[PDB]
Design a protein that fits this description.
part of a larger assembly, 8 chains, A alpha/beta, B alpha/beta, C mainly beta, D mainly alpha, E alpha/beta, F alpha/beta, G alpha+beta, H alpha+beta, A: alpha/beta, Cytidine Deaminase, domain 2, 8-stranded mixed beta sheet, 9 helices, F: alpha/beta, extended, plant protein, proteasome, UPS
């Protein structure tokens, strides 16, 4: 059996949120843990849940893999009805990207000894930004295969090459000692319904009308701002010569940019006035 | 070893305050309960041991099943003894407390300590035992104290109503200087 | 219980742990050896004044 | 309590006849039952009217329940006509 | 085995925080980036200009440390074991009393001088022909605190570095402000003082700048209270006109 | 001066909690009408309950005898120790229930649980929400002494405001999950009009429900708690007179002023849009 | 516009560009300009510069 | 449209968290610029489209990626010019009547400065172009900073009275950048007045360009 690029790793949304939160908690250093699940098949590895590691006072080493801790936690999880077997481990590289150091590499063999199909995950809490999550999974390339000059895996599928690797990883031994694992996300429909429910504003919030005096004062101030932007813009349109430099205008324009502020201010003024409109009067009808 | 969920149905009626048993019946029962908790925990760390009081203003569940022997000891030390045991309501709340389960795979075992006379009709005990039979709850009855005529027959009838493949036993502890724990050790309660 | 040292390149960095020699072994103004790789003070250079005086 | 909240203005005269009690003393009683935090409101002497912001909420039976039935059916109809107006206005306007 | 598995942290001085988590601090190296701190380091405890360690590899706030120590400061701090007694000192008994009223009388009851209507003495310089032994006077005066005293030869404080000449003086006044009751005596004061610079040397520029920085730190928009400085010089005629002013 | 137990002002429920609870319900109750119960972990500050993390705590309840409910404390205290080891900042704050409605034994669950927390909070989360709103409703037990003598002090669950907020990391993960659906380009009005319309669908339906219950009282099936009928009468009492004449001119004045401000805005947009159209003509001809 | 914006994502990924001021030019596209803090050096020219 | 909404992903990626110091000098064109960096040398990179391009053309404080060294955001002005308006701490609280009457000795000059500062309309309509700056000169030991700190007291403006010897910081050349930062923070703060004490300390006569 040759390890194949068509292998895919599934990490639960709960697992993702757990790694992200736990990494943020210990962003100053590196926090490690284990993923709980099973090996779906020779190509498919699914991950459900993780539990964090109480870390020894060494911020550059993962040499404190306490085994009494794992045994206790596994037994109690079994009592939960979750006998899932550890599928892999994750650790964080805040701002250091996804890659395997000598210490991580050493731990990786140490666990590969137990199970050849262990999955190591790297989560960047910092660069993992609103809309894009920075995480990657890696497993080691047998040094004997490398010394033989052979390709460590057989690729019947092109999925493994979809994500362009990080030049840091190329500096940190990618494809020489180890390789990346393509990541997708298994998402349950109920999880999606509840997730959509999260951002749903209170249906009353539309009812909370702004105080008329304050709203009117904002209108007044924004109108005076439109006056100032208008006069600035009149000068800007008039002073504009036949040879108007677009680059210079981008670098420095009238009042930052009279047109843009005019547009934004009219938009916000309209929105505020007309939402206040809707609020007051749908109250009038129904109350 | 089998995973078991045991709730020690402790009586708090008067008939444990007698000094005839050991030095004190209540103290002897406390020692017996502590030893039972220790033995059950030693059998498996996952075993669950619960506590319930039959007598008083009403049947109260002090410590639903738990393995923290500290909590069990603390609640035994803070017991206010008293009242007339409600064996029917006591067993009903004992079922309530043995359905206090984290691991659904464990078995249900009731340990009943009877120190006072049972003023309950045979029929009510039989229906309660049949409900337990439907719920597949093992019942162990510890009859201790002076054997008034009729209590033993009622307890045996309840055990028969609950007996299911020899999973329910009745233990009669004669009055004497022999500690309750020593007698309970030799009973099938500990051997399983 | 703290370690404070400055590199010979106008760079200052401290280690929460002293290193090979405990603070009882060292004193202020000393000049010792530290790891260029780990940035860890390994040993202590005994002494060397400018060769002009030497 | 008998009056609705829309007519919490009441002449001092009617208060007198219901109380059979004099103008000065009716006003005295009013300011007393407004001072005790029993009531909150205003009183206008020019026409001699009492603008109470004073309304309570308790003590009523099946007949008031049926009256609220009629009122709730009425306001359900009002909401229905509002919603129907919105729905009739939408098609020519959301399709653009 | 586990001790030598860690890495040190770069130390910087904060400039200001831009966001609730964004702060700008210049490390001990140079160009300063903006980084965050641990989520439990009591962000408000990170003073505007505080000295703390950064995640050397990450360059993020990890833990804060007190102000600098300027190892030269220690070198000039606990290097005077003199235990001179006033009995040994002689010939200046009236001078001994005046100097006592010059420095220790102020720390004794400055409220007395205030009730008088004048501020306590700022700084007194000792005038004496060469080989007069004024230095012995200061060595004995060191017998009033023995831990709250400061003595710098005013000639080892010079260096050929870019600007450390003013750095020594800055550290002096800083360490002095750190411990309220203490005096700083700077023998050989006639060296760094001088008269002026006529564009003769390339150090006189820097030397005169160091002299002015000491002048500024003396009574420059700030009074070093609870501490006065006594200096000695053999040649009071080569003293700069400013150092002889009532403020210095 | 008896109520020295800080009243729970509000509860903030974060996504991770809801996701964990939903996964628990699915694993334990995908194909059964059994509810799943658990324990809520976090910190309470200034009357606000921060429900940071939660874990599965297996639950049974007999489909025949609702009074009987299988939950045990061994794993509960074990997880308290283990999680607190992992994260010492957190501590137990409550126990959550996955269902649409409360049950009587929720009270004894709350009693047993309060031994671990003097002020525990019961949160009911509907794993399959049908209503448009927050899927969480917060509760805490209050010993209400009814003015009737014949009844002993009864512990009654009192609703507390519940809110959903996501940490920066949780917010990041949520948007990463919700990109295929969520809307940020909605001009604020579309949102506000939609919310007002949903609220109108709410209040009128609530009036109709009160009317249904009033017809119920008329038939003589269901009575009512004096307090809630009091509240309905209060709502009716505070009804302002929509036919207030000076108040009508007040409407007219505000309407004129706001709409002429909008008239300003439309004029200015005319100015800028026509300017840009002329510039477009210039760029097209050149 | 969106494709561009996603292109700027990698645009900001590549290393920046240093500033140069050629003190002396040499035939066949040879350049020795003043590095900001460093100095000068011998290099070649680009493909589309006169 | 649903994808171009992801055009906040570019913002998120760019901003990151570990951003470094910088300085805006000029741009070759849109999405193209050459910056002024604290590293003493200069590098030219592209811009971060997700920003107000019209921020500060003359000079500012921008970021740069640890590797790319490119602006991804711009923070507020933060320098070592110190808290100029330190309220009571940096307030001399000196009776205007300082060391002698000085009724025309320096009082009239200070009054002219205050007229250019507060009566701006007056030094404006007349068209008299009030003086630019005040550089005190006189015999050593007139209470050197006496009159100046006096101005700091009766004035409604924030004060920055820096010693002309603090300009030579440790790092090479950083002194000029700080000096620029002095005037930058002064202009930025408010209608305030700063002091540059011991001007000769930085104001020399001959230099040794070796």
């Amino acid at each position: 059996p040759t390890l194949d690029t068509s292998e895919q790793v599934y990490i639960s949304s709960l697992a993702l949120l757990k790694m992200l939160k736990h990494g943020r908690a210990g962003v100053p250093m590196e926090v490690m843990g284990l993923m709980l699940g099973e090996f779906v098949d020779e190509y498919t590895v699914k991950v459900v849940d993780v539990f964090a590691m109480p870390q020894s006072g060494t911020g550059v080493s993962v040499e404190a893999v306490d085994p009494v801790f794992q045994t206790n936690m596994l037994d109690m999880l079994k009592q939960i009805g979750r006998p899932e077997m550890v599928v892999g481990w994750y650790h964080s590289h805040p701002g250091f990207g996804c890659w395997l150091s000598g210490v991580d590499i050493n731990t990786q063999q140490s666990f590969e000894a137990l199970n050849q199909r262990a999955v190591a995950v790297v989560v960047d809490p910092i660069q993992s930004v609103k809309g894009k999550v920075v995480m990657d999974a890696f497993r080691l390339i047998n040094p004997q295969t490398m010394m033989l000059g052979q390709e460590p895996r057989q690729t019947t599928s092109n999925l493994g090459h979809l994500n362009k690797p990080s030049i840091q990883a190329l500096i940190h031994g990618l494809n020489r000692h180890y390789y990346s694992i393509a990541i997708n996300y298994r998402k349950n429909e109920l999880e999606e319904k509840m997730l959509l429910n999260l951002h749903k504003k209170k249906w009353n919030d539309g009812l909370t009308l702004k105080k008329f005096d304050v709203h009117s004062k904002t209108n007044e101030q924004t109108v005076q701002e439109m006056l100032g932007l208008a006069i600035k813009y009149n000068k800007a349109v008039q002073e504009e010569d036949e040879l108007t430099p677009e680059k210079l205008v981008i670098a420095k324009v009238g009042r930052q940019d009279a047109k843009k502020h005019l547009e934004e201010h009219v938009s916000n003024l309209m929105s505020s006035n007309i939402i206040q409109t809707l609020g007051t009067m749908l109250d009038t009808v129904i109350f | 070893m089998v995973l078991e969920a045991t709730m020690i149905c402790i009586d708090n009626s008067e008939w444990m305050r007698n000094g005839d048993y050991s030095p004190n019946r209540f103290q002897a029962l406390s020692d017996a309960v502590n030893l039972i908790c220790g033995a059950k925990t030693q059998s498996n760390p996952e075993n669950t041991v619960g506590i319930l009081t039959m007598a008083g203003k009403g049947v109260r569940v002090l410590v639903t099943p738990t393995s923290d022997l500290g909590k069990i000891l603390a609640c035994m030390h803070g017991l206010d003894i008293g009242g007339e045991m409600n064996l029917a309501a006591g067993i009903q709340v004992a079922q309530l407390a043995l359905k206090h389960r984290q691991n659904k795979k464990q078995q249900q075992r009731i340990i009943v300590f009877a120190g006072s006379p049972v003023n309950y009709d045979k029929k009510v005990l039989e229906m309660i035992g049949r409900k337990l039979k439907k719920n597949s709850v093992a019942l162990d009855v510890v009859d201790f104290g002076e054997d008034e005529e009729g209590k033993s027959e009622k307890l045996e009838a309840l055990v028969a109503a609950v007996n299911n493949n020899e999973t329910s036993h009745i233990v009669h502890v004669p009055p004497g200087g022999i500690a309750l724990s020593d007698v309970l050790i030799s009973t099938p309660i500990f051997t399983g | 219980k703290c370690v404070v040292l400055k590199t010979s390149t106008r760079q200052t960095i401290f280690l929460p742990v002293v290193g090979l020699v405990d603070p009882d072994k060292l004193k202020p103004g000393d000049l010792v050896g530290v790891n260029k790789d780990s940035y860890l003070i390994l040993d202590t250079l005994p002494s060397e004044y400018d060769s002009r005086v030497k | 309590f008998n009056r609705p909240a829309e007519d919490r203005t009441i002449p001092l005269k009617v208060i007198a006849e219901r109380t059979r009690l004099s103008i000065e003393d009716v006003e005295y009683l009013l300011m007393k039952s407004l001072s005790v935090h029993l009531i909150e409101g205003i009183i206008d002497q020019m026409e001699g009217t009492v603008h109470v912001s004073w309304v309570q909420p308790r003590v009523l039976g099946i007949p008031q329940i049926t009256s609220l039935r009629d009122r709730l059916d009425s306001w359900l109809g009002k909401v229905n006509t509002a919603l129907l107006s919105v729905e009739a206005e939408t098609p020519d306007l959301v399709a653009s | 085995l586990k001790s030598l598995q860690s890495v040190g942290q770069i130390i910087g001085e904060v400039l200001r925080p831009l966001d609730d988590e964004r702060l700008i601090v210049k490390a001990s190296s140079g160009p300063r980036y903006v980084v965050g701190c641990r989520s439990k380091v009591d962000k408000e405890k990170l003073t505007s200009g505080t000295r703390v360690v950064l995640d050397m590899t990450t360059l993020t706030i990890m833990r804060a440390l007190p102000r600098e120590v300027d190892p030269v400061v220690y070198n000039m701090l606990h290097e005077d074991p003199g235990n001179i007694s006033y009995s040994a000192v002689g010939g200046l008994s009236d001078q001994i009393r005046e100097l006592r009223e010059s420095i220790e009388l102020p720390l004794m009851n400055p409220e007395l001088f205030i009730r008088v209507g004048i501020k306590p003495p700022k700084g007194v310089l000792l005038y004496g022909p060469p080989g007069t032994g004024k230095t012995l006077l200061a060595r004995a005066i060191a017998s009033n605190i023995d831990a709250n005293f400061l003595k710098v030869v005013s000639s080892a404080i010079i260096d050929k570095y870019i600007g450390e000449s003013a750095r020594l003086i800055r550290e002096m006044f800083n360490y002095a402000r750190e411990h309220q009751p203490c005096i700083i005596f700077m023998d050989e004061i006639d060296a760094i003082g001088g008269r002026r610079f006529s564009e003769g040397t390339s150090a006189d520029r820097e030397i005169q700048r160091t002299l002015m920085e000491l002048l500024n730190q003396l009574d420059g928009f700030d009074q070093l209270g609870k501490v006065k400085m006594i200096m000695a010089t053999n040649r009071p005629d080569v003293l700069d006109p400013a150092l002889l002013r009532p403020g210095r | 001066q008896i109520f020295s137990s800080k009243s729970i002002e509000k509860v903030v429920v974060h996504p991770l909690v809801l996701l964990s609870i939903v996964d628990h319900y699915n694993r334990v109750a995908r194909d059964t009408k059994k509810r799943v119960i658990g324990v809520l972990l976090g910190s309470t500050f200034k009357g606000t309950v921060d429900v940071t993390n939660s874990y599965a705590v297996p639950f049974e309840e007999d489909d025949k005898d609702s009074s009987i409910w299988f939950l045990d404390h061994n794993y509960h205290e074990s997880m308290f120790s283990m999680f607190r080891r992992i994260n010492a900042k957190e501590h137990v704050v409550g126990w959550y229930s996955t269902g649409p409605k409360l049950r009587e034994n929720d009270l004894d669950v709350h009693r047993l649980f309060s031994d671990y927390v003097p002020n525990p909070v019961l949160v009911i989360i509907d794993v399959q929400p049908e209503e448009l709103g927050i899927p969480t409703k917060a509760y805490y037990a209050v010993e209400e002494v009814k003015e009737n003598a014949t009844q002993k002090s009864q512990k009654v669950f009192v609703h507390v405001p519940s809110e959903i907020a996501a940490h920066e990391v949780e917010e990041i993960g949520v948007e990463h999950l919700l990109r295929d659906v969520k809307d940020t380009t909605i001009s604020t009005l579309a949102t506000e009009v939609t919310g007002k319309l949903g609220a109108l669908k709410g209040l009128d339906a609530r009036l109709r429900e009160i009317r249904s219950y009033l017809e119920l009282v008329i038939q003589e099936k269901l009575p009512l708690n004096h307090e809630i009928l009091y509240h309905l009468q209060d709502v009716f009492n505070l009804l302002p007179n929509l036919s207030v004449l000076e108040l009508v001119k007040a409407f007219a004045v505000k309407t004129n002023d706001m709409m002429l401000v909008i008239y300003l805005s439309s004029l200015i947009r005319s100015v800028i849009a026509l300017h840009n159209l002329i510039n477009n003509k210039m760029l097209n001809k050149e | 516009h969106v494709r561009a914006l996603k292109e700027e994502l990698q645009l900001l990924q590549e290393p920046g560009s240093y500033v140069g001021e050629v003190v002396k030019v040499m035939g066949k596209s040879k350049v020795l300009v003043k590095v900001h803090p460093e100095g000068k050096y011998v290099v070649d020219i680009d493909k589309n510069i006169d | 449209k649903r994808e171009h909404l992801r055009a906040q992903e570019e913002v998120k990626r760019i901003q990151s968290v570990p951003l470094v110091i910088g300085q805006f000098m000029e741009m070759v064109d849109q999405n193209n610029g050459i910056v002024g960096s604290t590293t003493g040398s200069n590098y030219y990179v592209r811009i971060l489209s997700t920003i107000n391009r019209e921020l500060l053309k003359p000079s500012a404080s921008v970021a740069l990626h640890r590797h790319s060294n490119a602006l991804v955001d711009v923070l507020p002005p933060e320098a070592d010019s110190s808290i100029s308006l330190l309220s009571q701490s940096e307030k001399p609280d000196v009776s205007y009547n300082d060391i002698g009457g000085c009724d025309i000795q320096k009082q009239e000059i200070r009054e002219a400065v205050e007229l250019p500062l507060t009566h701006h309309d007056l030094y404006k309509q007349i068209g008299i172009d009030p003086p630019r700056g005040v550089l005190l000169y006189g015999p050593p030991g007139t209470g050197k900073t006496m009159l100046a700190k006096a101005v700091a007291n009766h004035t409604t403006a924030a004060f920055i009275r820096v010693v002309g010897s603090e300009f030579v910081q440790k790092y090479l050349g950083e002194g000029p950048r700080m000096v620029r930062d002095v005037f930058r923070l002064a202009k930025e703060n408010a209608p305030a007045i700063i002091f540059i004490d011991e001007v000769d300390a930085i104001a020399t006569a001959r230099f040794d360009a070796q």
